[PDB]
Amino acid sequence: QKSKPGVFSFLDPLAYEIWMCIVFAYIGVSVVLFLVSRFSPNEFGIFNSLWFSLGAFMQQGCDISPRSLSGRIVGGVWWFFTLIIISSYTANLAAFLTVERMTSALSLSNVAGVFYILVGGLGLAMLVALIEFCYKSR
Amino acid sequence: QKSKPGVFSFLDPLAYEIWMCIVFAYIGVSVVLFLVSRFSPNEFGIFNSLWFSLGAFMQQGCDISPRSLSGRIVGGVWWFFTLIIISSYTANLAAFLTVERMTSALSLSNVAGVFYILVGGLGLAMLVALIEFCYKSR
Amino acid sequence: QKSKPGVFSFLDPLAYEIWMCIVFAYIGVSVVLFLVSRFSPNEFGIFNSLWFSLGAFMQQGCDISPRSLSGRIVGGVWWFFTLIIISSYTANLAAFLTVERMVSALSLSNVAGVFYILIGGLGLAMLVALIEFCYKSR
Amino acid sequence: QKSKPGVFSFLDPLAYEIWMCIVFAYIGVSVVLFLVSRFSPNEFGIFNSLWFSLGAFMQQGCDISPRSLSGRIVGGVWWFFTLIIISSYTANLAAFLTVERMVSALSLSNVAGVFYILIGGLGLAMLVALIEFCYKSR
Amino acid sequence: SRALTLLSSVFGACGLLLVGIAVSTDYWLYMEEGTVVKMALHAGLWRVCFFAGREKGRCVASELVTENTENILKTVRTATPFPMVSLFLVFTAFVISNIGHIRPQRTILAFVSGIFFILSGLSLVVGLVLYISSINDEVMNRPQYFHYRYGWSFAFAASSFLLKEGAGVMSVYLFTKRYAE
Amino acid sequence: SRALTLLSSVFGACGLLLVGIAVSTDYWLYMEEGTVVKMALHAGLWRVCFFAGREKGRCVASELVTENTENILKTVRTATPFPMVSLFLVFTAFVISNIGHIRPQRTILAFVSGIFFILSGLSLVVGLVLYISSINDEVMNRPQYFHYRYGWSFAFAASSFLLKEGAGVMSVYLFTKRYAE
Numbered sequence: 007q008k009s010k011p012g013v014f015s016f017l018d019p020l021a022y023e024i025w026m027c028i029v030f031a032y033i034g035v036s037v038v039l040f041l042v043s044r045f046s047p048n049e050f051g052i053f054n055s056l057w058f059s060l061g062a063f064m065q066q067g068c069d070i071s072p073r074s075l076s077g078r079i080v081g082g083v084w085w086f087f088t089l090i091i092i093s094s095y096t097a098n099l100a101a102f103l104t105v106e107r108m109t110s111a112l113s114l115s116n117v118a119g120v121f122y123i124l125v126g127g128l129g130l131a132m133l134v135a136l137i138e139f140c141y142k143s144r
Numbered sequence: 145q146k147s148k149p150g151v152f153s154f155l156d157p158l159a160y161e162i163w164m165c166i167v168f169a170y171i172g173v174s175v176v177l178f179l180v181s182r183f184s185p186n187e188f189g190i191f192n193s194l195w196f197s198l199g200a201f202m203q204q205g206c207d208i209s210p211r212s213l214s215g216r217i218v219g220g221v222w223w224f225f226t227l228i229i230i231s232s233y234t235a236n237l238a239a240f241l242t243v244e245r246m247t248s249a250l251s252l253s254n255v256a257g258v259f260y261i262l263v264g265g266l267g268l269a270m271l272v273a274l275i276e277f278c279y280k281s282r
Numbered sequence: 283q284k285s286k287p288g289v290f291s292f293l294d295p296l297a298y299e300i301w302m303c304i305v306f307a308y309i310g311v312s313v314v315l316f317l318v319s320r321f322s323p324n325e326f327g328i329f330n331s332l333w334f335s336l337g338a339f340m341q342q343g344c345d346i347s348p349r350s351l352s353g354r355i356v357g358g359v360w361w362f363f364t365l366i367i368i369s370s371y372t373a374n375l376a377a378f379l380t381v382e383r384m385v386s387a388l389s390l391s392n393v394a395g396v397f398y399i400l401i402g403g404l405g406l407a408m409l410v411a412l413i414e415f416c417y418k419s420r
Numbered sequence: 421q422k423s424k425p426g427v428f429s430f431l432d433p434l435a436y437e438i439w440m441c442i443v444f445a446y447i448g449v450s451v452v453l454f455l456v457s458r459f460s461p462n463e464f465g466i467f468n469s470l471w472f473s474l475g476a477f478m479q480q481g482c483d484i485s486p487r488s489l490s491g492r493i494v495g496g497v498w499w500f501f502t503l504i505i506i507s508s509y510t511a512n513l514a515a516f517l518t519v520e521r522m523v524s525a526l527s528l529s530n531v532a533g534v535f536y537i538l539i540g541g542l543g544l545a546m547l548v549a550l551i552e553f554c555y556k557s558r
Numbered sequence: 559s560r561a562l563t564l565l566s567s568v569f570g571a572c573g574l575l576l577v578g579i580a581v582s583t584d585y586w587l588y589m590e591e592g593t594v595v596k597m598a599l600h601a602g603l604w605r606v607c608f609f610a611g612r613e614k615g616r617c618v619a620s621e622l623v624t625e626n627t628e629n630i631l632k633t634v635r636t637a638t639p640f641p642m643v644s645l646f647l648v649f650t651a652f653v654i655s656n657i658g659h660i661r662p663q664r665t666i667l668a669f670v671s672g673i674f675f676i677l678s679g680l681s682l683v684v685g686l687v688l689y690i691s692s693i694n695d696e697v698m699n700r701p702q703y704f705h706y707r708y709g710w711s712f713a714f715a716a717s718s719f720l721l722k723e724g725a726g727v728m729s730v731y732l733f734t735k736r737y738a739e
Numbered sequence: 740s741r742a743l744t745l746l747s748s749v750f751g752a753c754g755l756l757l758v759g760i761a762v763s764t765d766y767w768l769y770m771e772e773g774t775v776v777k778m779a780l781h782a783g784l785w786r787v788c789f790f791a792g793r794e795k796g797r798c799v800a801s802e803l804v805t806e807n808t809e810n811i812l813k814t815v816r817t818a819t820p821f822p823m824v825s826l827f828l829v830f831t832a833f834v835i836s837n838i839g840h841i842r843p844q845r846t847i848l849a850f851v852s853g854i855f856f857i858l859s860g861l862s863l864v865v866g867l868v869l870y871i872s873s874i875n876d877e878v879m880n881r882p883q884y885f886h887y888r889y890g891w892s893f894a895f896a897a898s899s900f901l902l903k904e905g906a907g908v909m910s911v912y913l914f915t916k917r918y919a920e
Contacts, residue, residue, distance in 0.1 A: 007699070008699075010695050010698065010699060011698075016366050016370075018525060020525055020526055021526060021527055021528060023527075023528045024526065024528055024531065027528065027535060031535065031538055034542065035542065038542045038545065038546065041546070042545060042549040045553060046550075046552050046553045046556075057347075057354055060358050060361075061347070061361070062480060064358075064362065064365055065341060065365070065479060065480060066338060066341075066343060067205035067343030067344060067481030069346070070483075071471075071475075071482070071483045074552070075467070075548060075552065076545050076546075076548045076552055077545070078471055078474075079548060080542060080545045082474050082478070082541075083537065083541030083542070083545070084538070085474070085475070085478035085480045086478065086534075087534055087537070088480075089478055089479070089506070090430055090534045091531065091534070092365070092369070093506070093509055093510045093513055094430070094513065094526055094530070094531060095369060096369045096373055096510055096514070097510060097514035097517050098517055098525065098526050099369055100373035100374075100377060100517070100518065101514060101517035101521050102373075102521075102524070103373050103374050103376075103377035104242070104376070104381065104518045105521045105522050107521070109374070109377045109378060111295065111296065111297045112295060112296050112297060112300065112370060112374045113297055113300075113695075114299040114300050114303065114687070114690050114691055114694055115691045115695040116370070117300060117366065117367065117370055118687055118688075120362070120363045120367070121303060121307065121683075121684075121687045122687075123362070123363070124307055124311070124359050124360070124362075124363045125683065125684050126359075127355055127356065127359030128310065128356060128359065128680060129680070130355060131314065131352040131353075131355040131356045132314065132317070132318065132352070132677075134352045135317075135318040135321075135322050135350070135352035138322060139321065145880070146879060148879065148880060149876065149879075154504050154508075156387060157387060157388070158388055159387045159388060159389055159390065161389070162387075162388065162390055165390060165397060169397065169400060172404065173400070173404065176404045176407065179408070179411075180407060180408065180411040183411060184411045184412075184415050184418070191489075198499075199485075199499070200342060202496075202499035202503055203341055203479060204476060204479065204481065204499050205343035205482065206343075207484075207485040209333075209337075209344075209345040212414070213410060213414070214407050214408075214410050214414055216333055217403060217407040217410065218403065218407045220336050220340070221400055221403030221404070221407070222400070223336075223340035223342045224340065224396075225396055225399070226340075227340050227341065228396045229393065229396065230503070230507070231368070231371055231372045232292070232375065232388055232392070232393060233507060234372055234507045234511055235375035235376035235379050236379055236387065236388050237508065237511035238376040238379070238380065238510070238511035238512075238514040238515060239376060239379035239382075239386075240383075240386075240511075241511050241512050241514075241515035242380050242514070242518045243380060243383045243384050245386070247515045247516055247519045249433065249435045250435060250508060250512045251435055251437075251438075251875045251876075252437040252438050252441060252868070252871050252872055252875055253872045253875040253876040253879065254508070255438060255504065255505065256868060256872040258501055258504045258505070259441060259865075259868045260865075260868075261500070261501070262445055262449070262498070262500075262501045263864065263865050265493060265496070265497030266448065266449065266452045266494060266861060268493060269452065269490040269491075269494045269497075270452065270455070270456065270858075272489055272490045272493065273456040273459065273460050273489075273490035276460055276488075276489065276490070277459055299690045299694070302716065303683075303686070303687055303690075306683050306716075306719060306720075307683070309720065310679065310680060310683060310723065313676060313723050313727055316727070316730075317672070317673075317676060317726075317730060320734065321669065321730070321733075328727055328731075373514075376511075376514060380518065435875075437871045437875070441864070441867070444864050444867075444897075444900060444901075447901065447904060448860060448861060448864055448904065451857060451860075451904050451907060451908055452857065452861075454911075455853075455854075455857060455911060458911065458915070466908055466912075
């Protein structure tokens, strides 16, 4: 029968190996961008490069962009990667929702996982802010 | 049989009534934003508001954003409209391509009209630039 | 048999529980981002954080990105949530249209709710602009 | 029956003619934007126009937006082109996956070409950074 | 600044009342089953009452029904703790904020009141999401017509979340103004 | 500035040669049909030659073949004008740029050379897009195996577009430097 959707059912469209490769590709792109910016110019520190890569993956307009050819090559290749990956995710999710193998409105049980992840992220961010605040005085 | 793709076959997903309503909605949003910005303050002129609305519809980051609640309501409602319209367009195009009623790789003949429109826009832009250049001296 | 889509039929792809939880998540993320950017170091007030969250959810970018670590964690989790939600909406709307056509462009009646929402938003924006005009002068 | 997706299988949704014409359209739009932004008044050099066109096609935003009327016409037609192209790509990939499933997540082999492209781009960018370091030192 | 304090305390009081009533009442969801009404009942958070069917008029504590609805009754108990947690958090925020207003000399109370209000709002959101997810996941497995509809206690909780978050924002601004003063 | 002038003139010469050869040659596409080879031929822009089949060795001018391929032969004639237009534009750009280099005192020649080169590139892109669109739209209606493959003249045109646009950018920069000097 129609199986109960899991907490992390939103990871179904892409294989877990693909997710792991995406995480390592994100880390590698950030490291390469940081090295290129530092050795061949700093606006692009390690944390700022991580933020740039994360914002590029989520298709959100970042506040800083590379201003050299060597960094812009990384930026363009990363944008192409993220566009292809997001298109593949959307297409695979649509294929999953069209043909059912063992259509009504999407239930909240299918996307409860991202709500749990969002709440956990907000709690972790509040904890980090508190830690930084108490450390700043000392 | 499979009919010959038209020049404007990319308008198939949405009815022409929806396209006309989108054009008038764009014009109206630009006019309302200009009126609100001028009467309740200018960075948002008529041309800049038209550019802002066009950039918002194409989901491209613009250089100017409303800085008052009255214009920000317009911006948010316009963003919601564009998001819903683009999602509907993509879904309808996917439905058209999946089920054939009277799958192989998309041929260039399906999107040839987009290239023709792009070239026409480039030519018109060059003509406008030339006109502005010769008028500026006089 | 005959049928005609009703107003606000574009809310079908996501259950109303999902929409309500999206509204609550929006308000919560905006308030938490304001909190972590006020007691600890910016431009992220309550209203500006609400605007940033609204822009991030609509995939329309933002004029200002968070700088603090907690603010960036909030931004990242919000971007992930909105990416998943938009992908799910597009995929399930495509599934709805494909199943409907399997048993034909979208008509104006399917997005009449979106156009009505746009008109109401413009009217409310003009009204609040008038109210601000009266209030600010005094 | 047995099969395995090949490398660069992600180019299947669009014919290679479409990809070639996309590359030519990118380069042409970049050069036309540079031409109309060099004589009408900016920051739109040939390299910056290439970066702007690449950012607009990837729907990832940009740090700089056109000011003149001709530049904004070029930007608008380019945005329309890239919106149509991305919508067509996503819709046809969804159609491909739906038809494949109608006759389960995407494996790493389906997007292995993208990862290979990313690795090659990072290596090329590091090489270009080294070359730029050597040239700028002298 | 006095007006901001008054509105912050008012919003805290309304949130506390709206969650206390929501927890104390038993109209979270009405569910009915019958063959095309065998029975029709309303269930709260701890007790269920039947207003139709063979056993009409009898209120049963969470322990005559198909297995699916009884599994739903079980699954509500899993999401039970979060409304209590949010009620405790908002009560602590209310008392700490009132103690802050009654003692203007001590200014740190407003910040902790805002933090507690915001945490209570997040906890309430988590509880509502978990409750709805459990209900939907249970009905999706159902194997005769089955109709369920949310009640006014759920609307009370939904409005109380917004009231808590407004009170938290007002408390943060009150703390900022107090430090500036 | 002399190096930029030499590079711009070189790129203009290469673009002119790459379009003249592409127009003058007859290897735009090879198409073959047979039953599972009845015939196999290569077709250019104005003349077609058969290198297999019953009539092998005979070159026929655009006027023994199924109706679909003959409709393809017709549809190429619709896209014929654009390569000629682009060739004329690039030839005018080449001569005007050479006249500009031979007379450094007159500086406006580089700008018009760049404009002509860029217009020629856009016209070539339009011609290639129209040609491919006509071919694809014609084969999509086909009712036996049919295989078609592009030739080296098409690659010459594709490379000549890039050469033209590079020459145009170089000419624009040359004119800017000349005005600055």
